[model samples]
Target: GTSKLKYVLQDARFFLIKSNNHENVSLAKAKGVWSTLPVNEKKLNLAFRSARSVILIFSVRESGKFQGFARLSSESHHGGSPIHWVLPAGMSAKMLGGVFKIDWICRRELPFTKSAHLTNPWNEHKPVKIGRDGQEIELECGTQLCLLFPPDESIDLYQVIHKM
Candidate 1:
């Protein structure tokens, strides 16, 4: 049997517009550490030098039993963190597809534009459509968000999703 790890909502940081700056909204049930990396790195040197943001996605602990999932915004800035998005209790990756879009009015918008823009320091903003089955979201902005297929148990966002 494949034993799974006991998981909990480690961190969540939702960025909201306060005045003209971006405010960090963090929530967490436990304490953890986070690190950043570059959006994309093809080689060992590039990967090592890349600046990355902290993020991870785990299965709901029970096999094929979808109980929704939680995501971390950035990392623990203070002694605590914030909740970015909770997919309810039964919302699977397939059910939550296409629900997220860029909030352009926010202080720091997603690097990807409607077409191609400046998504990262290296790549240009390419159109990235998010949905289920397609499961994986790839951006020319030097980052990619790939969710586990079939069971849709995991997900990861690299590079600049939320930045100043």
Candidate 2:
């Protein structure tokens, strides 16, 4: 077994899932002071400057009804192949239970703000995983996500993104 086959990247479209219902809407659907990284050529440079890696956690619907969730990585994908891995194929409530956490380490210390508050996007979700492919069986409950911050010594967001 090779660690090279550890992760896969699939194209993903953001979906706002609330309770048991799924919505085909963008983040803009939320009518409040919403802020996200600017979408521009600068996005990559800025992202790279502040983070070394990115971890994305998501769930699949199991049926052909929903496309499989893809987890993209910041590392330059070599061999010109779409990184992929096979997940259990089935439809069960256990599949949709917890927060899928992704950690992005800063390549350099980008600016970071203190006292930053991450509002509860969903009714009940909290950050609980790190790095690529980190898994938790409790996530089958399908509700909880929270953002975590690094220690004060590593205050800069950029420092959070570092090479392994």
TM-score of each: 0.20, 0.21
Residue 93 displacement (Å), model 2: 30
Query: Scored by Cα lDDT, where does model 1 land?
Result: 0.22
Q: Candidate 2 residues 1-164, lDDT tens each?
A: 21111211111212211111122112112211111122321232233344323232232222112111212233222233221222233523233222122232111211112212222223233322211122321222212221122222322333222322
With candidate 2 superimposed using the best TM-score fit, by how many Å does residue 64's alpha carbon deviate from the native? 15
Write one digit per residue (lDDT tens) for candidate 1, span 55-142. 2222122122211223333322322333333434554433322211121111111221232332232222322222121122222221
Candidate 2 at 162: error in angstroms?
8.5
lDDT of 2 at 121: 27
lDDT of each: 0.22, 0.23
Error of 2 at 70 (Å): 11
